[PDB]
Amino acid sequence: ENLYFQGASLTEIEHLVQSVCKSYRETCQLRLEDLLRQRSNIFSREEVTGYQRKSMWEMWERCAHHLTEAIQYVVEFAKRLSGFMELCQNDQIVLLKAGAMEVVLVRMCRAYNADNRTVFFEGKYGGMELFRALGCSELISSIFDFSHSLSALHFSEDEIALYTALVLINAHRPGLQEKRKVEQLQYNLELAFHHHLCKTHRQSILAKLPPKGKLRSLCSQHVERLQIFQHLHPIVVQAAFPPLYKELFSGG
Template identity: 55%
Template sequence: MSREAVKFGRMSKKQRDLLQAEVKIQLMKEQQMQLPSIPFSADTQGDKTALPSSSERPPSFVSVSWTGHSKWDTSCSARPCPVPKTHPSVQNHHPEKLPTEMGSRKSYFRDHQTYLEHSRLNIIQRLPPSIQSPECYGSPNFSSCLLSDRLISTVELDLLMQNVVCAHRETCKFHQENLQVMRWEAFSPAEIQSFQQKTMDEMWERCVCHITDAIQYIVEFAKRLNGFMELNPNDQIVLLKAGAMELLLIRMSRAFNCYNSTIYFEGKYAPLDLFQSLGCNDLISAMFDLCHSLCDLNLTEHEMAFFSSMVLLDPSQPWLQEKEKVENLHVKLELSFRQLLRRTHRESILCKLPQKGRLLSICQLHMEKLNIFRHMYPGIAWERFPPLYKELFVSETENP
C-alpha cells in the first residue's frame, strides 16, 4: 500500500474534531429550520420586548376578518421571538481536504447513527413503564416518546421549551413584576359604587372590549407557537375559536390577588361586586374560583405557558381536518412540559391542574349569559361589540 493511500485513508485528530463540529452544526441547522418564520408588524421603537398599550391600537381591534385567511393581523406590534444561537462557529475546510474526508465522513455518520439508536434505547428505558409502550400514544397520561416512528430528542424538546416560554412572555400585556407592584392598588368604595350604577349594556360593552384586547394577545401567542401556522387555516380558526376563552381564563389568574379576592381591572384591583351591573354574578364567581385554584398552585410563567399551549392545541376539538398534525404538536408539548417539570421537581402539579371540563363549563356559562344579554338588548352586540369578539362568540345566523 502506498504512503499516499495510507495518508489520505486516515484522518488526524484535528480533522476529525472539525468534522464532528460540522456535523453538530448541520443537525442544529436542521432543527432550527423547523421553526416557522411568522411575519409580524414589529414596532422598532422603544422597548423591543414590550407590547403596545391598548391606547396605541386602532379602534377596530382587528384589521382583517379571520374567514378565509391563514394568518391574522391583530394589530399587535410585538416582536417575534428570536431563535437562540446555540451552535459554535467552525472554520471552513480547505477545498483540497474535501475528497479525502468523504469516506471518513460517511463512517462518522454511521457511527453517529449507531450512537443515536443506542441513546434512544437508553432514554426509553428510563421512562416510566406506563409510557414506554407505543400503545400509550394518545392516552390521557403523558404519551410515548415515539412520535411518527422517531424519537423526539432532548435538544428538540429544549428548543420547543424556549419557543413556548418566549411566546408566552412576549404576548402577555402585563409583566408579572408590574402586577405584583400594583396588587394593593384597590378601588375605593365610592369607585365600586360608581361601577355598580352603570347600566348593563354599558358595563357589558366595557368588559367585552377588555376581553377582546386580551384575546388579541392570545392570537399572537398562538401564531408564535411552533407548528401552529403550518396547520391549515380551518384548523387554526377551530382551535382559536374553541380555546381563546379558555386561555383568557388561565391568563386571568396572573392578574388575580388571592389574598383579598380581587382582579386587575382598568388600572386597579377590583372585587367581585364591582361587576354587579353585568347581571352574571355566577359567571364572575366561577372565574374568581378558577383563579383561586390556579393561584394555589403557584404556577411559574414557564408552567403557565405550557398549560396554555396544551389547552389551545387540543386534538379532541371537533371539526379538525388534520387532527393528526394537532395531535403530534400536542404530544411534543406534553413531553417538553414533563421535561421541564422533571428538572424543577414539580411533576406533582400535573394532577392538580384544572380539568378541561371545568374550563369548558365556564366558557359555556359565558355563552349563556351573552345570549341572555342579547335578548335583553337586541342588536347591541352587532352595533357596539368589537369584530374579533363577534367573530368568536356571536353567530352570524343569530344577527337580528
C-alpha cells in the same frame, strides 16, 4: 411541514420548551411584576359603587372590549407557537375559537390576588362586587373561584406558557381536519411541559391542574350569559361589541 408534526428527540423537546416560553414572554400582555406591583391599588367603596351604578349594557361593552384585547394577545401567542402556522387555516380557526377564551381564563390568574379575592380591572383591583351590573353573578363567581384555584398552584410564567400552549393545541377539538398533525404537535408540547416540570421538581402540579371540563364549563357559561344579554340588548351587541368578540362567541 414542521419538525413537531413527527417524533421529537430530547434535544428537540428542550428547544420546544425555550420556544414556547419565548412566544409566551413576547405576548403575555402585561408583565407579571407590573400586575403584582399594582395589588395595593384597590378600588374604593365610592369607585365600586360607581361601577355598580353603570348600566348593564355599558358594563357588558367594557368587559367585552377588555376580553377582546386579551384575546388578541392569545392570537399572537398562537401564531408564534411552533407548528401552529403550518396547520391549515380551518384548524387554526377551530383551535382559536375553542381555546382563546380558555387561555384568557388561565392567564387571568396572574391578575388575581388570592389574599383579598380581587382582580385587576381598568387600573385597579376589585372584588367580584365590582361586576354586579353585568347580571351574571354565577359566571363571575365561577371565574373568581377558578382564578383562586390556579393562584394556589403558584404558577411560574414558564409554567403558564407551557400549560396555555397545551390548552390551545388540543387534538380533541371538534372540526379539526388534520387531527393526526394536531395530535403529534400536542404530544410534543405535552412532553415539553412535563419535561420542564420534571427538571424543576414541579411534577406534583399535574394532579392539581383543573379538569378540561372545568375550562369548558366556564366558556359555556360565558356564551350562555352573552346569549341572554344579546336578547336584552341586541343593538348594543350589533353596534358596539368588538367584531372579533362576535366572531368567537356569537357566530358573527
